[PDB]
Design a protein around this ligand. Structure first.
Ligand SMILES: NC(=O)c1ccc[n+]([C@@H]2O[C@H](COP(=O)([O-])OP(=O)(O)OC[C@H]3O[C@@H](n4cnc5c(N)ncnc54)[C@H](OP(=O)(O)O)[C@@H]3O)[C@@H](O)[C@H]2O)c1
Ligand SMILES: NC(=O)c1ccc[n+]([C@@H]2O[C@H](COP(=O)([O-])OP(=O)(O)OC[C@H]3O[C@@H](n4cnc5c(N)ncnc54)[C@H](OP(=O)(O)O)[C@@H]3O)[C@@H](O)[C@H]2O)c1
Ligand SMILES: *c1nc2c(ncn2[C@@H]2O[C@H](COP(=O)(O)O)[C@@H](O)[C@H]2O)c(=O)[nH]1
Ligand SMILES: *c1nc2c(ncn2[C@@H]2O[C@H](COP(=O)(O)O)[C@@H](O)[C@H]2O)c(=O)[nH]1
Ligand SMILES: *c1nc2c(ncn2[C@@H]2O[C@H](COP(=O)(O)O)[C@@H](O)[C@H]2O)c(=O)[nH]1
Ligand SMILES: O=c1[nH]cnc2c1ncn2[C@@H]1O[C@H](COP(=O)(O)O)[C@@H](O)[C@H]1O
Ligand SMILES: O=c1[nH]cnc2c1ncn2[C@@H]1O[C@H](COP(=O)(O)O)[C@@H](O)[C@H]1O
Ligand SMILES: O=c1[nH]cnc2c1ncn2[C@@H]1O[C@H](COP(=O)(O)O)[C@@H](O)[C@H]1O
Ligand SMILES: O=c1[nH]cnc2c1ncn2[C@@H]1O[C@H](COP(=O)(O)O)[C@@H](O)[C@H]1O
Lengths: 473, 473, 473, 99
């Protein structure tokens, strides 16, 4: 990477410490930028969802992969639950989304709460697999909780066959009272739904798909136990990518874990982390990893810095690690600390091939957690670290009370945090729009038409805290 | 520019990061400083009003130009509205201001709200072009909103012929109940008003006028569409200066737009921006621009930094760009981030020939927005960026709903902001006093009698955030 | 001054940016340190009170000079009021203080208000010059405001002859209900008062006195008008030191004012400021000044930095100017920005001979302003700059309304500020105890027995914002 | 309320509320010379003298004047207080429009 003349600080840099200076550009439109990655992950946008139980569920996996990202299932997930989630994701349609479905015998109480598991603003009343009505939040307003869905469902709705041009579906819904088109199979059974915004995103995002045309999904594994047997079971379950994840990725047990998985020859991309040094990046690649996950400390749920003093400013860590992996034909994932789209753009400019986002996506409809409200009726969801006392409790529940007490000495993560939803744009696809629009604008500012050209052409500068304050938050 | 020995930091600088060291001075008075610019804009004070719809209206254009600045009309303005605004500004008197005028049949409701479109504190009642009374806010206190103006108008007021020396008018109003002198034409028709403060400003500020002696006004044009045909229509409408404006001014489309306007040979100063690099400055000047607008990110309504990471600390950007423009005989406008008079002074010390100010002037009586009040009865006006959802909607309202949806992906500006009016000095001329008094003191501190000597003689230093905190805000 | 190895930052330093590293010391006690100055001011502590109308009154001048400092009377004071203040100060006792005095005919309303003009907690009731009672705040609690002093005054009080050993007076008051000994002349007339703390301070602070044994006092003069005639009148009125003062001290009008005063050969130390550059220090000294006042911007009432961007971090300014002055046999006063005793200590370590303090001392009983209370009953007093709209209004009240309106364009100071009094230690002598105890501890940490050894032996270091945060606020 | 020119502003401000006139009369040798209102003491140092803030101009009339005429003399007066004087010029008291 190139920095402005004289910008050689005597310290390491975070995303807040740096800026991109624009260059000469011939890219006429921000829609001309190709956001596809080149690390073998198969993503068409540089966004990976972290293997955190508060974020990485089946609804998130379907929604993100349709728009070009990928979700890493957490390592604490049982293999049967993994197999059920993968089979659900890989049976999803590439354009039409899975709606909330309700039986006419369901209670209005259930209908009100289930509505927010998706961002469509409406649920489809189904009977024997066929749509018979719609339910919105307005239909549940004032009704007793224990009335049935059949008493409140709207009986008329827009229907269209699966395979219809999304541009046409956009025009069908211009003057419809509900911005939902119920997509049906030739026999009349429910195939899914498609909103006006969903139709727009169909011509903007390319789905991340496997060799069979099914949505991609990844899975994580720990370094304890039989790593090889666990990795092979995840591969046979249908995972398209494997993440061997641990806090201190530069230890001997991680090196042995990588070799055990690589020697099985699963034919899948192997991600291993986390490290923040050039030496650790080389050692993980030499062990058999093709992608190195970079980040020790920056996660919004992490207390590692305050507990140990161990960490590294994430921008400088990605710059050094991406350069070391580039020498060996490897790639780097920037993992942790993403708060605004500039953090995504700056990580990619630093040399990362993908960016892993965690806590930010917990505050969305699609995340696994229940939607909550504070005293001011502001919507929010919980997030927590995978090394907190809450996560360790659910992961080690099978141990004796003696071992659980001794292990309770260590906690390097928060057990609860409030992640607010934007009152208007509360879906993960709204955040993807936010992130990708910013990255696309970064590329045209530097004159790049794709992500390799971004890292090649970017010129960076160092600023003080006053520099970061320039502009509006 | 000269910096103190050893002040060569490994980062770029904002206005907050630097300070001016005083030098030996023989300038006896701060009124002896010449504030005229030498970039061909014609401004006698180094203030340009940004081409933002929330700031640049006809009341702003008249008021600022009389005091020596210039207003750039936004590019979203229809050519008919531009012609009507230019003809209004170029028919204004050089000393006597345009008051709020009222018909005696107007409602007290209308009279109360219209008062705050000027800073005179009084409106003139007019019948067939001739003044017959005055209305103040004290006259509207308690009266029914739908009583007529004639029921509360003050029948006696100070009058004087247009052309009277402003110093005499100052003396006529010393003991008058209302500090407004109604200036009249030989036939008795209204020519305008002149307050005590307005008479003082006539001896301090030189109006910015064209070759016919009429107040100057500028106009902005985008890089899309037929830039040549638009620029020529703006020239024939009477614009004294043309601004070709876009966020990423260092792209091929901007370079072609400059050449298309330059080859038309309109005989007007040609401004193009925005860039923050020396290379960008040279490319714009070589394409045909005489003035380069500098600034990517620092605007108070901008979110470009947080969306993309793209931007440059404005002080270092002005320093590098002004030196590159100077090499080619061109000039540089410092655009964005002005919060206090020190920002204007430091930008001129960095080598800029003019300073463009936007959001700061939205919180004045003369800006186009309506005057609003919060729950605490504090006066304020709205401000918003020209690339926000609000501005883009008005600029693309005639496109199809499909295209407006796709274009909705990008938003690099805030759509609403509260800019407070100083409860005492709420007029834009009060801010011009504040700004120019600071620049004049800077010039005497360094020993400069004019703006070229300011950039020539200034010595600068770098400070930490503790240095900026010294003093009171 | 010596800095630690490698501590050569690329920016200028404030008091917050630096620290002192202790060295080997044989100074057994902090009471062994000699705080006397060597600049010819005659002060025995390194404290000078600023020539600000909100701080520099006759009660302040008496109290500080008895403890070793000196007060500079403001330049706006008429020569008649100057002569009266000097004659009051030079007739004061060197040990015994001047109390608030009351007539028995005075109202309780006046007694409770007058009580806070001194820090004694008691006023002396006087009749024909002799004491007849005491009045405390508890004696006025609940009494009608227009009852007379004779109705509430305490009739018995401790009395002692003037010249008594303060050590004994400390013992006389050990068991007295009111901590004040009324000091009397041989004929029984009131000579003043002395408290337990006041007797302690007599053995700690050496009074600053002239050649005849009378308390010292200084006076300021501006650079406009007949500077030579104004300086001579101040010399004949009894001033012990002259201060030629202006914001921009490095201008031609100041250099002529110094030469005009030096040519009169008044035999007094001549102070001139303000500058922040070595070149300005040399020019003022060569013009005839023996002491250069350093500081442009750091004053708590100043807005110069925000209006103009002109200034310099005060520590670096003092280091440079003190070094240039010492080459020419001159001295430097550190003027502005003192908030804590460390600021005084660091200014002396930087090479200043004396430290000027302004607004900090406004929040004391002895300052000329009236004592005020907020809604929470917190004691405070007003402070304001000598270049604010309030100050220039009184200074130019005799000019025409036209000129005062034109000069209203410039305002480089705030016109009102709330300076809180410490509810326990509200006297200026308490702040003197606070400041000088800190400076004495600084000298023993460095190994210095006097102020010249402090500057000679001190080793300094540079810190970040985190370094300044170490310790308790 | 009567005030000497040597009285303090602090005393003058507090004494004004012993009557409903809203103004006090400054007196030197029994003669009315100035008026003190609450607006005169607003912002002034509490221990300045009354002689610094007194209004030297006030409506005056001899005692025994018809109240109806005194009422009309005060219609446009800034202070609604008329100073009534004895034949020798000394102060006889005051008379407001409502009085
Ligand atoms: N000075 C600044 O930092 C700044 C920042 C934002 C906005 N603005 C203000 O916004 C107004 C104009 O709106 P605009 O900036 O959107 O320009 P515009 O003139 O309305 O359109 C810009 C054109 O350039 C293309 N473009 C390519 N890369 C771009 C990029 N990185 N950012 C923006 N457009 C890009 C756009 O196509 P696509 O849209 O299809 O990509 C579009 O065709 C002006 O008043 C300008 O001052 C200024
Ligand atoms: N130490 C500081 O940083 C600082 C800052 C502000 C004020 N002050 C305080 O203000 C008081 C004196 O008021 P003053 O400084 O306005 O001086 P002053 O003695 O009242 O007047 C200064 C004279 O110098 C001229 N001048 C030229 N350049 C000037 C500049 N940059 N700033 C001010 N005057 C300039 C003024 O003419 P024009 O007015 O016509 O230009 C005027 O004739 C002192 O008590 C001083 O301590 C100090
Ligand atoms: C520290 N870090 C933790 C913990 N659980 C997960 N993580 C890391 O944070 C990343 C997410 O960062 P965000 O800022 O939330 O996007 C994860 O990918 C993982 O690397 C924990 O308990 N402590
Ligand atoms: C970013 N920048 C924007 C937008 N509209 C205008 N601008 C820029 O800001 C300047 C004004 O800055 P202030 O800090 O308000 O004085 C304008 O002149 C223009 O360059 C926007 O939506 N985003
Ligand atoms: C700026 N500086 C001003 C003004 N009046 C006085 N001063 C300066 O400040 C010093 C006092 O500083 P503190 O921090 O209050 O102790 C004075 O000695 C003088 O140099 C003013 O209006 N603006
Ligand atoms: O569309 C739906 N209809 C009915 N129940 C649902 C629907 N989506 C989720 N649920 C229920 O909510 C549980 C949790 O879903 P998750 O949050 O998507 O894992 C499921 O196991 C179901 O019981
Ligand atoms: O002096 C005035 N008298 C009456 N109406 C006015 C006056 N100034 C502005 N208006 C009204 O306010 C509208 C907006 O004015 P603007 O804010 O100056 O563009 C005008 O089109 C008029 O309808
Ligand atoms: O001891 C005192 N007794 C009575 N009045 C005092 C005393 N000290 C100050 N004053 C009054 O307060 C005014 C202002 O005093 P200063 O605040 O010390 O300048 C004086 O002019 C007196 O009117
Ligand atoms: O007009 C006045 N001038 C001066 N002092 C007054 C005046 N009226 C009352 N006082 C004072 O206030 C005290 C109490 O007055 P009373 O409340 O009327 O009894 C008197 O004894 C005087 O000291």
């Amino acid at each position: 990477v190139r920095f402005l003349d004289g910008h050689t600080p005597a310290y390491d840099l975070t995303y807040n410490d740096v800026f991109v200076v624009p260059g000469r550009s011939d890219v006429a439109s921000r829609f001309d930028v190709d956001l596809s990655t080149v690390d073998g992950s198969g993503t068409t946008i540089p966004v990976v969802v972290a293997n955190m139980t508060a974020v990485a569920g089946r609804r998130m996996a379907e929604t993100v992969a349709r728009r070009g990202g990928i979700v890493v299932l957490p390592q604490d997930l049982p293999i049967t639950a993994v197999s059920e989630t993968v089979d659900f994701v890989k049976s999803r349609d590439l354009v039409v989304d899975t709606p909330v479905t309700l039986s006419p015998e369901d209670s209005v109480s259930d209908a009100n709460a289930l509505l927010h598991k998706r961002a469509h603003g409406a649920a489809v009343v189904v009977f024997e697999g066929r749509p018979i009505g719609l339910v919105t939040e307005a239909n549940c307003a004032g009704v007793d909780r224990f009335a049935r869905v059949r008493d409140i469902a709207l009986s008329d709705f827009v229907t269209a066959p699966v395979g219809t041009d999304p541009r046409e579906v956009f025009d069908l819904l211009e003057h419809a009272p509900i911005d939902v088109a119920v997509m049906t199979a030739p026999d009349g059974t429910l195939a899914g739904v498609l909103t006006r915004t969903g139709a727009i995103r169909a011509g903007i995002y390319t789905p991340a798909v496997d060799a069979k045309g099914r949505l991609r999904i990844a899975a994580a594994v720990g370094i304890n136990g039989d790593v090889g047997a666990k990795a092979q079971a995840l591969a046979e379950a249908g995972a398209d990518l494997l993440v061997i994840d641990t806090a201190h990725g530069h230890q001997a047990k991680m090196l042995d874990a990588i070799k055990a998985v690589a020697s099985l020859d699963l034919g899948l991309p192997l991600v291993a982390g986390n490290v923040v040094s050039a030496e650790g990046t080389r050692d993980l690649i030499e062990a058999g990893a093709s992608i190195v996950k970079v980040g020790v400390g920056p996660g919004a749920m992490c207390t590692t810095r305050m507990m140990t003093g161990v960490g590294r400013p994430q921008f400088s860590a990605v710059v050094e690690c991406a350069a070391a992996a580039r020498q060996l034909g490897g790639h780097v994932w920037a993992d942790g600390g993403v708060r605004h789209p500039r953090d995504v753009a700056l990580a990619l400019a630093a040399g990362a091939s993908n960016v892993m986002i965690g806590s930010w996506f917990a505050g969305t409809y699609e995340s696994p957690g229940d939607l909550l409200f504070d005293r001011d009726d502001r919507p929010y969801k919980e997030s927590y670290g995978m090394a907190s006392k809450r996560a360790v409790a659910a992961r080690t529940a099978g141990d004796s009370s003696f071992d659980r007490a001794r292990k309770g000495l260590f906690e390097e993560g928060i057990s609860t945090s409030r992640m607010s939803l934007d009152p208007a744009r509360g879906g993960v696809e709204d955040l993807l729009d936010h992130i990708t629009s910013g990255v696309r604008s970064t590329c045209t500012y530097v004159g790049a038409a794709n992500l390799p050209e971004l890292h090649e052409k970017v010129v960076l500068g160092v600023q003080s805290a006053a520099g970061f304050a320039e502009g509006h938050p």
